[PDB]
Symmetry: C3
Subunit: 307 residues, 3 copies
Amino acid sequence: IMSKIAETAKRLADSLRELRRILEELKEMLERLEKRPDKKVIVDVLKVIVKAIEASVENQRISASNQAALALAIAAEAVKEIEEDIDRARKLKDEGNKEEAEKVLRKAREKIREVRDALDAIAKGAGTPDIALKAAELLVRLIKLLIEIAKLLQDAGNKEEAEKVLREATELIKRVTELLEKIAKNSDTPELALRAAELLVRLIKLLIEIAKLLQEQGNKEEAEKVLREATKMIIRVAQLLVKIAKNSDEPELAKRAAELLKRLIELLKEIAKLLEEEGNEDEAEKVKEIAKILEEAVRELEERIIG
Amino acid sequence: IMSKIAETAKRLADSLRELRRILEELKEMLERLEKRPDKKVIVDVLKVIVKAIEASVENQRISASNQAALALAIAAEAVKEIEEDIDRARKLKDEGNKEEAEKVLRKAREKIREVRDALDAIAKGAGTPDIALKAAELLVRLIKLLIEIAKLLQDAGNKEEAEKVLREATELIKRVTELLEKIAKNSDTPELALRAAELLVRLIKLLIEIAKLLQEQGNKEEAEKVLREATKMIIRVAQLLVKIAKNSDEPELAKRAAELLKRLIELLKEIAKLLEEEGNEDEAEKVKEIAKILEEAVRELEERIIG
Amino acid sequence: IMSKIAETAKRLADSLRELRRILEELKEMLERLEKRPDKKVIVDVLKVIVKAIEASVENQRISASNQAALALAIAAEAVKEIEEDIDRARKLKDEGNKEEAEKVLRKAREKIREVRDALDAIAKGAGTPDIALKAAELLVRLIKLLIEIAKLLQDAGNKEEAEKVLREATELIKRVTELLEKIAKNSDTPELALRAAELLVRLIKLLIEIAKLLQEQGNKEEAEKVLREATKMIIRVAQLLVKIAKNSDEPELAKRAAELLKRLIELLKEIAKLLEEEGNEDEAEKVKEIAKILEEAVRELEERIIG
């Protein structure tokens, strides 16, 4: 993040230098038009006015990008503040103040919503897709922090309070998932699509930890629905992972997709294990059936790794 | 604050898009002027140049507003750093290092002055008044943190050091009060004036806690002057609160002004109680006389609530 | 830093106001050109277009400067996060988790590299030299935090891991030193050159603490090279300090250079003391010879202080 603050600052410094140069050439065209005007000489003068505004627009573009990088760093500090207050509320539950920790967690939830609204805004207006991925990488941390909040509520006994929190993280995962899918779809390089796939693999594991926590509350009826969203997302990611490795600039992008495709298999095992504990063994064996589909997909990738 | 970073970023993204569109229309006018020039056709071309610069000015406006939101978030993190170092210096007084805590508090005081200089600057150049209110909301926290500093100095025995700190927060309250009064005076909507009134009610309570702390030091001669500023400010706020509730867009703005007007009464009770402890019972009964004025003002508001 | 956020915001607010005024004068020139055009009247109209873009360029300049100040504050918070994690890893070594602290220190090292890349970028594109000095002041803290990391590695027994860290801080000191030398060379006022000299005196002491830590590991062969860079840097700084005090706007700048020149002498004593422990007493007496050169340089400065 701090390195993206560096790049956006260096590129902003270049555009501002060229904008200052195009300003001096704008004033030289004032001299060229002060000596003698003409009907067609003005055309070449407006060429500088256009180059002046376009140099200003590009500077205001990178300036907005540098502010985005500064906004991503402030948002990262906001997540760390929430994490400190979560561990603080965790300390309160362990120390004995289980009642006061519920006020610290309701603060962090309003904080998480506020950092979410910023990160989602930073993701939409992202001239560079790395701004969106870094924003999604922090939105992922907000979701995992939302899961850690619900586990403290469940540990404190506020199971009804934790379900709504888990339902909120469930809706946050889908929103970030759709953003990550757009980044991967529109990814010009295979590296950016793989970075979105690494976060998508995490959003599935977050979706799994929600399901197990939903099972611990007793809401085995909704953890089924949540596992249906994780199993669906794994299929999309696997489609993406197989496509990234098929059209591989470097073979290192295929092996990393092979590692992630193994993770989709492993995460699919826990889904079937959790579906077994829910009693839905029929849908669990179908989940294992998808795992054997992905296993074959990983196996054929390792063959291209050697062949 | 993080939500204001979102709004300013989204509005910046829109202005930058329209600035890029007005750039392409600027280059289309280069084509329209390359084919054939004229004496009056140039007029409509400059219309785009004006729309190009105005689209750039508005983008540089929202960009400055987004930087202000980023500056308000960095300032909020600065207040939290000061608060951690205050609680740290509080731990040092409780642990035994009352001598080293005085260096931590002198650091935080120089920090508070620096965050104050930024927040006051952010308040002046606020294209949106919410930038100024959020800035005032953090300047309020700086003042309460300045009060907590002086109480640690008083608890550590540095009564002479705490008075100057309390005199510094007294001068900070007036500065933020004048800003809050300008925001409420110039408030287009009753919501913004009520938000300034909520902070004004806090600045009075801060001014009261300074007075009691000034009484604990023995400077009952200056706590009188400080209570004279709190009693004056309550009158101004009550004038504002009664006016906000009179011209109420929603009746919910009147009840909140009724709650605050009750707080002005309660805060006025402590002023008379502190003036009683100072011995100025004559000015204390006059303070109770203002409380009965506000009580009647609250009562008539509740009648309009029902009538 | 927060005060520089204030100044850059206030100056940005002024440029944006004048940019809005020059926008209205741009639209008045649209009226002046709508009534009647001419061949030479257009010249004075383009004068406003030039003043409009130049008012926009200066606003985009201060806007980039305000973002730099916001980037310097975010970088300062990043150093404080690294320092908290260093003290945390220090707690882990004292508590017993010497193995897990090595993962916290490798995180902080990647953090230090990232804050370094930003601060170095902020230093290059610094319209105001105070942006570069504040950036160098934080890069100095990154180096001292890098030294505290290596001492924990040495205390944990990872001497081979600490040497590379110390070699990394050694290369960081030179980079910041060259920046500080450029700031002092190009300093218009003697105050800015003295501020660079105060950090240069610290980079030498950091370079000394690296040498002693390199001696504690046993790498007395490289601490010699490091002390050769500190002894060289002291000569450059002393040349700078004597020149700053010679051409002194205020005499207070000479006494502060006298204090720093004493520090260069003291730091030169430890170099000779460390070179004595390394066995290089021959180069150590030559280091004392430079100390007596600086002593005479300080003595002659105190004579001008009185004469």
